[PDB]
Short mmCIF file of C-alpha atoms in Angstrom, two decimals:
data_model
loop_
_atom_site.label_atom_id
_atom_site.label_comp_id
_atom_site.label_asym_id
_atom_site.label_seq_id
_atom_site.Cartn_x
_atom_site.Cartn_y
_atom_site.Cartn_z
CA UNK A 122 6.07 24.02 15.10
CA UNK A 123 2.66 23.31 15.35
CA UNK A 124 2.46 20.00 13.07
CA UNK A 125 3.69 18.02 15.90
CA UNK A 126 0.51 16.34 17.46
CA UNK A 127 -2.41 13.99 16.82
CA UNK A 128 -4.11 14.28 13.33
CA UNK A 129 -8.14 12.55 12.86
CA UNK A 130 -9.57 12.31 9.91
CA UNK A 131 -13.44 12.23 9.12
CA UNK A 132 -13.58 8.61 8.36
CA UNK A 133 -11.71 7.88 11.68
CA UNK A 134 -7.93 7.18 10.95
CA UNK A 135 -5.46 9.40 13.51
CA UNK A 136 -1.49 9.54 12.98
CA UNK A 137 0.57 11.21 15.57
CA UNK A 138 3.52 12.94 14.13
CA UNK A 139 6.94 14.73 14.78
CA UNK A 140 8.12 17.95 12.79
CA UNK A 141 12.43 17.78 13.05
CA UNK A 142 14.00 20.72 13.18
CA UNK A 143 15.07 20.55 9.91
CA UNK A 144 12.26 19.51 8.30
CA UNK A 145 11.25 16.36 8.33
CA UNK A 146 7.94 14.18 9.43
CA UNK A 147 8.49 11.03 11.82
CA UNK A 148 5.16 9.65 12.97
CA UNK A 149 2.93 6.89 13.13
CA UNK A 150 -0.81 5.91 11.07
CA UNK A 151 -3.32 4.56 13.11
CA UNK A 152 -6.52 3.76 10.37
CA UNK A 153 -8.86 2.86 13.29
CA UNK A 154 -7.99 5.14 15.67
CA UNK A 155 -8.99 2.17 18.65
CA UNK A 156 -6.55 -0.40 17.33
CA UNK A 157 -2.35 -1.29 17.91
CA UNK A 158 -1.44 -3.79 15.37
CA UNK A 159 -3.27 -1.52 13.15
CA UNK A 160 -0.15 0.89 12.91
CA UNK A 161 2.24 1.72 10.47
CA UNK A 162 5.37 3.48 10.51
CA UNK A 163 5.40 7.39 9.04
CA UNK A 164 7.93 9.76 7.08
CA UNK A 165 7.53 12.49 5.27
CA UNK A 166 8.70 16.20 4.75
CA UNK A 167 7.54 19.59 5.04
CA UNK A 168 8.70 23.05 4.91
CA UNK A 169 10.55 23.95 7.80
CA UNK A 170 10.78 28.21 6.79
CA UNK A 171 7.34 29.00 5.45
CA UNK A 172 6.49 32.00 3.66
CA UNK A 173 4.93 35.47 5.66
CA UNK A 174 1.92 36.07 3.40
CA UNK A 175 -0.85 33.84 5.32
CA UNK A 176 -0.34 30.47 2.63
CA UNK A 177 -0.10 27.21 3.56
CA UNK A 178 2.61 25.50 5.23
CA UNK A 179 3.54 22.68 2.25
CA UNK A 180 4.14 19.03 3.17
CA UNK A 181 3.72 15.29 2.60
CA UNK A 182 4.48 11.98 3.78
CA UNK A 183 3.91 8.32 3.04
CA UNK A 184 2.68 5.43 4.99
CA UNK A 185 3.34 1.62 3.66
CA UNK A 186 0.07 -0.57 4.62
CA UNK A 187 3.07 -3.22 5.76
CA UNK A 188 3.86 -3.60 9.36
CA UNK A 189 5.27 -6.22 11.60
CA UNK A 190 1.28 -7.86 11.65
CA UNK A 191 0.08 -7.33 8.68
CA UNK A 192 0.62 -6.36 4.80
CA UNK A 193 -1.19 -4.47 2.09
CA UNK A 194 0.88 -5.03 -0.43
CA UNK A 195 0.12 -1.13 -1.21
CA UNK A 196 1.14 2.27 0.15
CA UNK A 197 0.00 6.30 0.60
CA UNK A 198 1.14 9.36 -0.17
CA UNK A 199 -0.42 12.26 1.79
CA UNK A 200 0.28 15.71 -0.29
CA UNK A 201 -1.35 18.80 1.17
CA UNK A 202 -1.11 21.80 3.39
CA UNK A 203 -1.63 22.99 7.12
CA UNK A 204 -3.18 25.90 8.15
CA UNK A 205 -2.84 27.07 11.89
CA UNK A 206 -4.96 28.85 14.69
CA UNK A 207 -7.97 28.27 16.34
CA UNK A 208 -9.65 26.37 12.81
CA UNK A 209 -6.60 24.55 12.07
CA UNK A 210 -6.35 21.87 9.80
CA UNK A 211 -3.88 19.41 7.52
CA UNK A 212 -5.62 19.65 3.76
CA UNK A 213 -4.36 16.76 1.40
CA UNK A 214 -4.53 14.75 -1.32
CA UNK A 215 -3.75 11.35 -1.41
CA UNK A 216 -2.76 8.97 -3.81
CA UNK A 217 -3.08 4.96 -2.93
CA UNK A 218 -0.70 2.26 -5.07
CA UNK A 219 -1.10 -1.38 -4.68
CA UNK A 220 1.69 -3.89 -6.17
CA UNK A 221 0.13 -4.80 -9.78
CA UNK A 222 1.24 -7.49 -12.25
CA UNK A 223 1.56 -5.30 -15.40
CA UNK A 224 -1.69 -6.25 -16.35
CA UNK A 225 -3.17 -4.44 -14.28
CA UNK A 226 -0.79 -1.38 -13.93
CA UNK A 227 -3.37 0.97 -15.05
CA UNK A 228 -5.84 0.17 -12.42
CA UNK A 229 -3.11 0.78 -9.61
CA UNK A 230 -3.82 3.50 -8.32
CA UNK A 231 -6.80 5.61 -5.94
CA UNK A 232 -7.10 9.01 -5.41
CA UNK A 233 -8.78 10.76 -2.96
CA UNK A 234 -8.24 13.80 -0.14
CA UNK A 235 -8.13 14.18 3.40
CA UNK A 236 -9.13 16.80 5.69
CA UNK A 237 -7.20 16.24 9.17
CA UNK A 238 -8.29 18.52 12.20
CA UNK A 239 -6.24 18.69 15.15
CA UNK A 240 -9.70 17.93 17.47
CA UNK A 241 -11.94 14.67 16.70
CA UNK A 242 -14.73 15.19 14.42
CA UNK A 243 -18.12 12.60 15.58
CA UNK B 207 16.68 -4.90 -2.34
CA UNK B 208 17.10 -3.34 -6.27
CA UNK B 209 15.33 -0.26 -5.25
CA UNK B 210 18.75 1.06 -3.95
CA UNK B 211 20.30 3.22 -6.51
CA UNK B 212 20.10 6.21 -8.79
CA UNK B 213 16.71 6.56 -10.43
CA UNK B 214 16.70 9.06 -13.78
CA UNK B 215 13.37 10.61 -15.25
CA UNK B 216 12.48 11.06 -18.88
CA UNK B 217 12.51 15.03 -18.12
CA UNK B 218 16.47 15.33 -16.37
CA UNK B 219 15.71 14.39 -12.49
CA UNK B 220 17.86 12.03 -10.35
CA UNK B 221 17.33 10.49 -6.71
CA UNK B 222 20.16 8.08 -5.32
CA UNK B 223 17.97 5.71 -2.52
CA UNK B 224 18.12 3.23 0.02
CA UNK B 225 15.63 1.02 1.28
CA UNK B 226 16.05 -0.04 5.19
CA UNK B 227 16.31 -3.46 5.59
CA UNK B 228 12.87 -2.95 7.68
CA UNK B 229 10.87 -1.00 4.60
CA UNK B 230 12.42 2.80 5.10
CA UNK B 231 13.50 4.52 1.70
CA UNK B 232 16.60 7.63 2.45
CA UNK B 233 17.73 9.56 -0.52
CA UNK B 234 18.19 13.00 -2.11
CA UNK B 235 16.29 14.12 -5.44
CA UNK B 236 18.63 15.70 -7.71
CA UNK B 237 15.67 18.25 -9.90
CA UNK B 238 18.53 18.65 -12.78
CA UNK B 239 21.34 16.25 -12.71
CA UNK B 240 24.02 18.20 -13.30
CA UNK B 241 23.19 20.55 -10.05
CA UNK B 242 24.18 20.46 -6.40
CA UNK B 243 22.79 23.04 -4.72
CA UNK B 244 19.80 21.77 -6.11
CA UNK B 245 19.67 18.74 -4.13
CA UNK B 246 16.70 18.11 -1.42
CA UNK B 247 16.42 15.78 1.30
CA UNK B 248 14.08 12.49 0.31
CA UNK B 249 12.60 9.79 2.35
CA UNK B 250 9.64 7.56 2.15
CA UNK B 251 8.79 4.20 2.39
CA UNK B 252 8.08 0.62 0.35
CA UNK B 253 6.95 -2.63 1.43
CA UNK B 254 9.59 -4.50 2.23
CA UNK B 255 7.86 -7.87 1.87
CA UNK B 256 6.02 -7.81 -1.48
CA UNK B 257 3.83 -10.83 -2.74
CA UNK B 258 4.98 -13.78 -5.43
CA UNK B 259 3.11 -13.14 -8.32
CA UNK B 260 5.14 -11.46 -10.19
CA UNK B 261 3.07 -8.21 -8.76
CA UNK B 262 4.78 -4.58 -8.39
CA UNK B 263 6.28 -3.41 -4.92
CA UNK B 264 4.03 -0.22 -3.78
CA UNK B 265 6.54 2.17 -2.71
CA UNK B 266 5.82 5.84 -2.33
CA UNK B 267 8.16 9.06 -0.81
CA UNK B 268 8.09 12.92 -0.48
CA UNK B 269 10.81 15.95 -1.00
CA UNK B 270 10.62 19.33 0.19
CA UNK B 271 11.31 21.71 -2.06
CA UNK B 272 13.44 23.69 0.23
CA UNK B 273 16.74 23.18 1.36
CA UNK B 274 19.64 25.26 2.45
CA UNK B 275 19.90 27.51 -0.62
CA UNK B 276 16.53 27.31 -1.75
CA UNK B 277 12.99 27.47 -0.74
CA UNK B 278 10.13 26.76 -3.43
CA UNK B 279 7.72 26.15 -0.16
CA UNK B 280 6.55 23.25 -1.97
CA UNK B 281 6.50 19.51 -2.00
CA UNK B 282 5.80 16.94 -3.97
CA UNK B 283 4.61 12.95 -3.22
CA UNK B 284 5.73 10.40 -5.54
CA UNK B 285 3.27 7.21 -5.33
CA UNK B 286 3.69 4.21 -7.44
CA UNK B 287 5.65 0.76 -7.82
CA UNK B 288 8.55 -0.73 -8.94
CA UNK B 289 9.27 -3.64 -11.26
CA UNK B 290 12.29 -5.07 -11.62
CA UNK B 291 14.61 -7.33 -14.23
CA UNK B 292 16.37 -5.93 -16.93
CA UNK B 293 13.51 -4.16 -18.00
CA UNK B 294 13.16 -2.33 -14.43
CA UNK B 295 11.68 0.51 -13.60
CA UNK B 296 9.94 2.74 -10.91
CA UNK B 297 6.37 4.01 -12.07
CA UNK B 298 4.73 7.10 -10.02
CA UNK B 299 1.92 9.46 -10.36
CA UNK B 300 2.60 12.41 -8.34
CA UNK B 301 1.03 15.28 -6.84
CA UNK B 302 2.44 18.80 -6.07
CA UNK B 303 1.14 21.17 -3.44
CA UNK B 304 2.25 24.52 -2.63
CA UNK B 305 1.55 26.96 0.43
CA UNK B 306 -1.43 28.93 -0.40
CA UNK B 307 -3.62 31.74 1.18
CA UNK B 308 -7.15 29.94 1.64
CA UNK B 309 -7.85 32.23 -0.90
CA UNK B 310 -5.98 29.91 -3.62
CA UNK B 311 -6.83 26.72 -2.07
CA UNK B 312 -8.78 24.93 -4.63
CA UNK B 313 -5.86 25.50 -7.19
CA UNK B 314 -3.05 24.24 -4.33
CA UNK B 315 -1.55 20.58 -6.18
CA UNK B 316 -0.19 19.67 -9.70
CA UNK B 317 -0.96 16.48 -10.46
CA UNK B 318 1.80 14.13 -13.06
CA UNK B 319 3.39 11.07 -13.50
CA UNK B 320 6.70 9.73 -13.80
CA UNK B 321 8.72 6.81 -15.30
CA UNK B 322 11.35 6.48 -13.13
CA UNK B 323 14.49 3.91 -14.92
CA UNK B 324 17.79 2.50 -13.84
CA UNK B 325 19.64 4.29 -16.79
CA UNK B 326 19.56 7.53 -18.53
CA UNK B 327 17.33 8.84 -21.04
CA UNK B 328 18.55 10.72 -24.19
CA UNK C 12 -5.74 22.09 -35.52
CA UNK C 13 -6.73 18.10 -36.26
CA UNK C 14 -8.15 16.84 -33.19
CA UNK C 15 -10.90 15.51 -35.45
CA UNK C 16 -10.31 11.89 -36.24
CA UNK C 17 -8.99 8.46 -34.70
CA UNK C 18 -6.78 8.15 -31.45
CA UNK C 19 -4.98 5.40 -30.39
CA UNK C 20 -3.06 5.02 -26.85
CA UNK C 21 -0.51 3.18 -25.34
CA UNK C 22 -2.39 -0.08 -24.55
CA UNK C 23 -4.11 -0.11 -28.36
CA UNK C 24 -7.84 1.39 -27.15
CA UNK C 25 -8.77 3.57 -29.12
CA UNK C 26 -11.71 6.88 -29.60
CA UNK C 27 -13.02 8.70 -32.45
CA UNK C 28 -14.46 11.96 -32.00
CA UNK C 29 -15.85 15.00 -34.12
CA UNK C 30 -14.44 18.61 -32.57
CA UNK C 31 -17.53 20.60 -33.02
CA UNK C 32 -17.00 24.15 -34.21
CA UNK C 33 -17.00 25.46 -30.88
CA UNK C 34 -16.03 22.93 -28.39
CA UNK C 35 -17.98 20.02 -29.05
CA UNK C 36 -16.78 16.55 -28.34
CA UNK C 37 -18.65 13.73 -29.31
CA UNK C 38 -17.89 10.14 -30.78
CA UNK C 39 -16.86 6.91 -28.89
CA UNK C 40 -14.30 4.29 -27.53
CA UNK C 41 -13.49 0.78 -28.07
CA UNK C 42 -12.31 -1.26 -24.69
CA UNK C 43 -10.23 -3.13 -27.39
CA UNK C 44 -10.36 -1.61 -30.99
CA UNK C 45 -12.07 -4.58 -33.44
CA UNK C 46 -15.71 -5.19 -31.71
CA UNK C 47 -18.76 -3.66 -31.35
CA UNK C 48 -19.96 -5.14 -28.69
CA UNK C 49 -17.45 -2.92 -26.64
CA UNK C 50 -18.12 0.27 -27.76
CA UNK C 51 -18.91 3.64 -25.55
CA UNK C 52 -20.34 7.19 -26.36
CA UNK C 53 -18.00 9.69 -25.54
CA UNK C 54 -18.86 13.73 -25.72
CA UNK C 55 -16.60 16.29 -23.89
CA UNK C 56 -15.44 19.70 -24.93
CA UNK C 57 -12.17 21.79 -26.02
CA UNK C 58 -10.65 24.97 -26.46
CA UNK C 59 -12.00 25.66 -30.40
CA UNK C 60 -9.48 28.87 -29.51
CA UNK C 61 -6.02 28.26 -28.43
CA UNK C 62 -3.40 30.68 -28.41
CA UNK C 63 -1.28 31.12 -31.10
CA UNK C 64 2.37 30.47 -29.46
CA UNK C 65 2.18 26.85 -29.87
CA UNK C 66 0.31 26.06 -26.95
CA UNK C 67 -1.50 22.86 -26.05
CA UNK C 68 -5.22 22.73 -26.70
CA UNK C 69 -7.14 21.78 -23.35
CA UNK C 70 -9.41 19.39 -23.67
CA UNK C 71 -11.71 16.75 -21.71
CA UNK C 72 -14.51 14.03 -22.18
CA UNK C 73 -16.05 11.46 -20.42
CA UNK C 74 -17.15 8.04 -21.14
CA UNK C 75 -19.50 6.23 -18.97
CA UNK C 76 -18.94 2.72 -19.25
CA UNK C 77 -22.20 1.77 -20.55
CA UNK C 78 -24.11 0.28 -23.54
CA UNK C 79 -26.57 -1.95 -24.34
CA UNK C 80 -23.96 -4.88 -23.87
CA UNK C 81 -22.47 -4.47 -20.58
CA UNK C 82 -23.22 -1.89 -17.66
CA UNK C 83 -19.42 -1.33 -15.80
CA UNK C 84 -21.73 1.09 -13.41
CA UNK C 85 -18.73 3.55 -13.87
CA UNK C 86 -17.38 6.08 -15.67
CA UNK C 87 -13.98 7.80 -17.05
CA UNK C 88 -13.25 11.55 -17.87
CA UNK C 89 -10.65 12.64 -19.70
CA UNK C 90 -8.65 15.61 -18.75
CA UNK C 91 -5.52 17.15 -21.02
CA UNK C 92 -4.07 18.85 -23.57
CA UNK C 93 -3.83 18.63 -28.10
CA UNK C 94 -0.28 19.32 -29.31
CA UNK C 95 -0.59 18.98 -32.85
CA UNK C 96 2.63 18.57 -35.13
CA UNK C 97 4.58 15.75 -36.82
CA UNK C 98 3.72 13.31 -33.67
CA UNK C 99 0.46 14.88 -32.57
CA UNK C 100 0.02 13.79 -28.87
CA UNK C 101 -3.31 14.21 -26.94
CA UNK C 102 -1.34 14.16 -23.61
CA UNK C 103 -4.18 13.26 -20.83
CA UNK C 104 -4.77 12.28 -17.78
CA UNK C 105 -8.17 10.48 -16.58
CA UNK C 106 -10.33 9.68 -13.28
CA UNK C 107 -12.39 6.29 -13.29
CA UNK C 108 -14.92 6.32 -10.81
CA UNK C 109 -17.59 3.57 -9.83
CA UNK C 110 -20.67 3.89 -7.77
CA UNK C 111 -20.03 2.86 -4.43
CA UNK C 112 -21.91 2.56 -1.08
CA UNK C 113 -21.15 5.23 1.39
CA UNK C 114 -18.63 2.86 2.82
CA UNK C 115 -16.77 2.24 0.09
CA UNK C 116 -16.61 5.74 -1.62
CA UNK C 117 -12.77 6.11 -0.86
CA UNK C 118 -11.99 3.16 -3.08
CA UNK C 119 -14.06 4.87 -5.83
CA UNK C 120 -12.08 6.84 -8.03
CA UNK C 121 -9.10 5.09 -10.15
CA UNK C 122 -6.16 8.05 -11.37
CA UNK C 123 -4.09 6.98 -14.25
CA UNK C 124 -2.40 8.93 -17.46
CA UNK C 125 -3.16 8.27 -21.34
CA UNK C 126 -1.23 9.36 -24.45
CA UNK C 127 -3.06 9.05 -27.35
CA UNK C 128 -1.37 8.76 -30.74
CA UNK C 129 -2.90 9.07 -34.68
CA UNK C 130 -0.90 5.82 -35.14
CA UNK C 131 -1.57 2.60 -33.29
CA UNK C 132 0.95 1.81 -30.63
CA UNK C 133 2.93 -1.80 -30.68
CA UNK D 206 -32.84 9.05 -9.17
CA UNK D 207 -32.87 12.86 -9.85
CA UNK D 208 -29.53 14.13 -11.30
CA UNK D 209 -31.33 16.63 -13.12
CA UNK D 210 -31.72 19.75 -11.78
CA UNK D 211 -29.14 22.77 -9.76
CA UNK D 212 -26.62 22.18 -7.99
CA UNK D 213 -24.13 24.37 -5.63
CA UNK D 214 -20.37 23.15 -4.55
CA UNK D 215 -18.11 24.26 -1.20
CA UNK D 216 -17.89 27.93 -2.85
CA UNK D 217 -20.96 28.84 -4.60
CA UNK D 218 -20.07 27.66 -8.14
CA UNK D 219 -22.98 26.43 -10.11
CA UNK D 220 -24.11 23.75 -12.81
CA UNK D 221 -27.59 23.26 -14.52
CA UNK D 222 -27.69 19.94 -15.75
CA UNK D 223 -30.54 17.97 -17.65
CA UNK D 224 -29.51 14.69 -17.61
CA UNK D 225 -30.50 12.70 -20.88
CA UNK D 226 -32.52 9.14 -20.22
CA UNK D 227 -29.52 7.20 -21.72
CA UNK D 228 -26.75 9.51 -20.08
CA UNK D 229 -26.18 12.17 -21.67
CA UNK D 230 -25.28 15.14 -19.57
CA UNK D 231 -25.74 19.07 -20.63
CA UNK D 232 -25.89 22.22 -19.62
CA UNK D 233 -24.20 24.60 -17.38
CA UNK D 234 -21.08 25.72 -14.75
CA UNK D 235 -20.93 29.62 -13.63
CA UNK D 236 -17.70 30.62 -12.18
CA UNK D 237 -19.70 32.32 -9.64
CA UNK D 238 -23.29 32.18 -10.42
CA UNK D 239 -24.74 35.91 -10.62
CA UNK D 240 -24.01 36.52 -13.61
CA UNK D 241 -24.46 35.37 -17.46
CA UNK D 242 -20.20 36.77 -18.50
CA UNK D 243 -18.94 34.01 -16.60
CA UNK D 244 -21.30 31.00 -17.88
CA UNK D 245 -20.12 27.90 -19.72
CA UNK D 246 -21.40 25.00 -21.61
CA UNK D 247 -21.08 21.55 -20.31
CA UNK D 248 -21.61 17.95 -21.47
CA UNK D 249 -21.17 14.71 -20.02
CA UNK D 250 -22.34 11.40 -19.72
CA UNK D 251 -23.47 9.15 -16.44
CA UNK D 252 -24.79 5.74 -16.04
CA UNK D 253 -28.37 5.38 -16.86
CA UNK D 254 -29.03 1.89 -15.04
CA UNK D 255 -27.11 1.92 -12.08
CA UNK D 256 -27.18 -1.19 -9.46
CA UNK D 257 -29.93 -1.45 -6.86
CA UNK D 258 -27.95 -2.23 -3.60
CA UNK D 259 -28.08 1.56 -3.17
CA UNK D 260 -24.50 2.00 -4.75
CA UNK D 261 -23.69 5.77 -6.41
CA UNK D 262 -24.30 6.37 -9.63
CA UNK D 263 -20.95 7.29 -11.58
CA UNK D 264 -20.62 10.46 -14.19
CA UNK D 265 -18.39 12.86 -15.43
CA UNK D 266 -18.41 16.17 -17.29
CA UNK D 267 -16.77 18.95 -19.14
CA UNK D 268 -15.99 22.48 -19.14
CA UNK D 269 -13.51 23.83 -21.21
CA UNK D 270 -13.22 27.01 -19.86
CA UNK D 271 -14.33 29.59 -23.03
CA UNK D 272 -17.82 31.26 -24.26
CA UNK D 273 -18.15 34.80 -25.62
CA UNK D 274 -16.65 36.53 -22.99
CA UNK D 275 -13.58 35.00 -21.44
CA UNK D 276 -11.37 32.05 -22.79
CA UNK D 277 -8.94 30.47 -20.02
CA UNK D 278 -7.35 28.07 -22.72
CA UNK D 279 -8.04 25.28 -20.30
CA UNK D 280 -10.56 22.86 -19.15
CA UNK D 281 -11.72 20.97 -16.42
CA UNK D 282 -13.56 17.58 -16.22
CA UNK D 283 -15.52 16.06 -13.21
CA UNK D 284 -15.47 12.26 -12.47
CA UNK D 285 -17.78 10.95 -9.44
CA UNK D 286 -21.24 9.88 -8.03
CA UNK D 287 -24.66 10.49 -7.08
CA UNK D 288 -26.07 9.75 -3.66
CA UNK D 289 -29.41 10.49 -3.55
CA UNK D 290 -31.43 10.47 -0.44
CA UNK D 291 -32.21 13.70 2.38
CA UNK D 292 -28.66 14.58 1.58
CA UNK D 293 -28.41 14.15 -2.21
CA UNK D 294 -24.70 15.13 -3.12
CA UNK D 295 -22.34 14.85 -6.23
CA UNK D 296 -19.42 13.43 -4.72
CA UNK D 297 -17.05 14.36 -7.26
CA UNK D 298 -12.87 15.13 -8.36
CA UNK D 299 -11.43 17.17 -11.21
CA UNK D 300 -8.81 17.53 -13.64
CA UNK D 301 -7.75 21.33 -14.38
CA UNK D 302 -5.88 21.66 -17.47
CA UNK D 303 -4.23 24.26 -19.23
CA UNK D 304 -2.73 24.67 -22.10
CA UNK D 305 1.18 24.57 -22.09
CA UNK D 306 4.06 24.95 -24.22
CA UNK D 307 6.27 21.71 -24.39
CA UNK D 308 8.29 22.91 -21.44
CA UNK D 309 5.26 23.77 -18.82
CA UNK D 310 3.46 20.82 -19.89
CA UNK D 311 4.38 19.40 -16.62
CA UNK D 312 2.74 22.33 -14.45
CA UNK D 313 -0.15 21.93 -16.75
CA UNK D 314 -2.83 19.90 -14.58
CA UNK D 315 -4.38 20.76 -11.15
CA UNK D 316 -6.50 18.75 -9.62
CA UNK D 317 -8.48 18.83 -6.56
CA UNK D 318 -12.24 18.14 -5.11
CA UNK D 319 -15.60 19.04 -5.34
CA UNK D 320 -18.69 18.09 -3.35
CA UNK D 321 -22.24 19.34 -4.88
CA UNK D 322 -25.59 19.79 -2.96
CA UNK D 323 -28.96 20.94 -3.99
CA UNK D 324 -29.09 23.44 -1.54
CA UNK D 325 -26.27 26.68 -1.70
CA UNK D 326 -23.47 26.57 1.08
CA UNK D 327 -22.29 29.12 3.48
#
């Protein structure tokens, strides 16, 4: 069960997040981490039976840079993995659309990765 | 709202969706299309107010691949947008991460893309 | 075993390249396709020994978006796979990244796919 | 404004690099780096004249995995930037392909991070 909590990120972004039963992700993104209109809701999914061999514990979830102050135009996709214990951590990738005229579809899209600790990092 | 709907992939997927009237996206993602055991839960999200110029409507979502007859301890993120008309269709690049030993880390996510139309390919 | 020659992809750019005996890639790329004043050295390497049961031939290059013309302060690689036969494909996918300040390095890397075909697209 | 030299990633992987005074990139990556069995050749290309406002400076780079001892019938290319200074790092991301029949050509790209630093990690 231990996905439920707080997330930070390096950069300083923090999402809070519930792991249902079943298996899916409810949360919240904060991208400050000191802000409130600067939420945005959360979903996602991750594997609610992992496997007994020490590997990761698969998920993802998006977040849609649209909320009831502000708008984006864009949204994320977290995909990763979380490792428990003492160092334990959510590994992703991320990918970032934005709405494009088809002009500029090919330019759409960032990538990047994000390592989440459960415990701030500076 | 003409996100809602079945959505088929050049390879033989299928995901029926809705979108929230506030910016949530509920589904399943069929992997065949001829399955049903093979059906996993899907939600995500999309901005629900996108801009007037003609520009896409970010959307992104995530499936585990586990459900109650199968566990791949998997999941994979869909990001993208859709465009709409007669011509409509839902464009993604995707990652795919599985649970790994740290061990096996570095080679954890499949990266793709996917053309995701309102009616069947071949 | 003709990855030598002229490639064209889905948006009409196009790249010629020599496949050096071993794994050599060099030639260049054309923004467009008729100018010179948009033209880009391109090396890279490739597998000069596949496997014989009609697998891909992986592949990648790199073009930093510079000449003596315009400086983009960027650059694209090229990451995929030859699959040679009545349509040979080169099936890729590419990162574009541009120098950034420390605070904008997560906004520095573009993700996007290419196919490339011997015969101009529409 | 010194890309040229050694450079060591999160695991101990290595790659010599001389880095030509238009952009041209060569030299090496060593799955490990004790050890000449596991070397391979690498070529790339990065921008020569990057901006002054202290902005990265954008390459990429190839290694199809093969030489005289192994071939993986795959390759991987590097797309990123150079931040000089106390802490000079390659900020980079890669592309991991392998070769695929028709069918796997899906599962045929990994893709991941990289960070490089002058000095070895842990």
């Amino acid at each position: 069960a231990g996905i439920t909590g707080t997330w930070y990120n390096q950069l300083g972004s923090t999402f809070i997040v519930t792991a249902g039963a079943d298996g899916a992700l409810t949360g919240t993104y904060e991208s400050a981490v000191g802000n409130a209109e600067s939420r945005y809701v959360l979903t996602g999914r991750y594997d609610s039976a992992p496997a007994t061999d020490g590997s990761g514990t698969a998920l993802g979830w998006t977040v849609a840079w649209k909320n009831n102050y502000r708008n984006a135009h864009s949204a994320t996709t977290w995909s990763g993995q979380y490792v428990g214990g003492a160092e334990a951590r959510i590994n992703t990738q991320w990918l970032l659309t934005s709405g494009t005229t088809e002009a500029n579809a090919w330019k759409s899209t960032l990538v990047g990765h994000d390592t989440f600790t459960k415990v701030k990092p500076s």
